[PDB]
Amino acid sequence: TEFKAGSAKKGATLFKTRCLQCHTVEKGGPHKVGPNLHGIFGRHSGQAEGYSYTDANIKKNVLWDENNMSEYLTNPKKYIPGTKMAFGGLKKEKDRNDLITYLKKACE
Amino acid sequence: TEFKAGSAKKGATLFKTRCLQCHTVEKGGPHKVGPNLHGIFGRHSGQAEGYSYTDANIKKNVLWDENNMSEYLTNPKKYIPGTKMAFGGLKKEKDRNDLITYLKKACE
Numbered sequence A, B: 001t002e003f004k005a006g007s008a009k010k011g012a013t014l015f016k017t018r019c020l021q022c023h024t025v026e027k028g029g030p031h032k033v034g035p036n037l038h039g040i041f042g043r044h045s046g047q048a049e050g051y052s053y054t055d056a057n058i059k060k061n062v063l064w065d066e067n068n069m070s071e072y073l074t075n076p077k078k079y080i081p082g083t084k085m086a087f088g089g090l091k092k093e094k095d096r097n098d099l100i101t102y103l104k105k106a107c108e
């Protein structure tokens, strides 16, 4: 790709410190501020039921792959202008590789 | 995406006339000229076991999503220079949408 595997353990702690405030990853996990992300890989943006997405996310219709996800995480608002996800971004590719490695695994 | 759903039925007949000569889609289907494609979506290129891929496909490490797949099908050799897949391409987006619609479904 333009994405390579990292440390899932490192990625777990990245999740906890940077994403857990708003999201769950487990199957049967609830929506919070943000939507539960189980099964995100391969699904298009805006399709978790019971969550109120912005117009912007839905119409962006991103197919979530480890690769798209990387560009998204760099700068969410640059990627989906108008998203209400209030997260600045993960500028280091190594951080993103770690986190996505952990998401790839925990969201299946 | 930059890909929209079409006719899975139309996509089935596209498969039969243009891809079936070399590939199977069913779970438990054999490799032929080309590899069995069950589960292709979300997997990287070159990872079906028991198939002898070209150096080119493997190192290209494409993550197969309905979207990548479209660009691939336009012109396989332009996309993976050196691939031994001898298929010229499906130039009409509508044809590709139909076929991918059918693959999305039959390869799960």
Ligand code: HEC
Pocket: A015, A018, A019, A020, A021, A022, A023, A033, A034, A035, A040, A044, A045, A046, A047, A048, A052, A053, A054, A056, A057, A073, A082, A083, A084, A085, A086, A087, A090
């Ligand atoms: C609250 C301050 C957030 C933090 C921190 C993170 N996310 Fe988030 N995310 C949040 C919201 C409110 C939304 C909805 C956006 C909208 O415009 O509707 C999102 C969305 C996602 C998505 C898209 C999900 C989809 O189903 O399309 C993803 C892939 C995502 N968020 C991932 C994620 C990760 C991995 C984070 C840690 C770096 C993270 N988000 C932080 C809110 C919040």
Ligand code: HEC
Pocket: B015, B018, B019, B020, B021, B022, B023, B033, B034, B035, B040, B044, B045, B046, B047, B048, B052, B053, B054, B056, B057, B073, B082, B083, B084, B085, B086, B087, B090
């Ligand atoms: C024989 C003349 C082919 C026809 C017609 C089609 N494909 Fe093919 N495909 C063929 C080969 C020999 C290979 C291997 C390529 C190599 O360089 O190793 C491929 C590969 C694929 C792939 C990649 C699979 C992977 O696991 O990475 C895909 C996605 C694919 N072929 C799809 C496919 C479709 C949908 C076709 C009909 C339009 C099709 N191929 C035609 C051989 C032949």
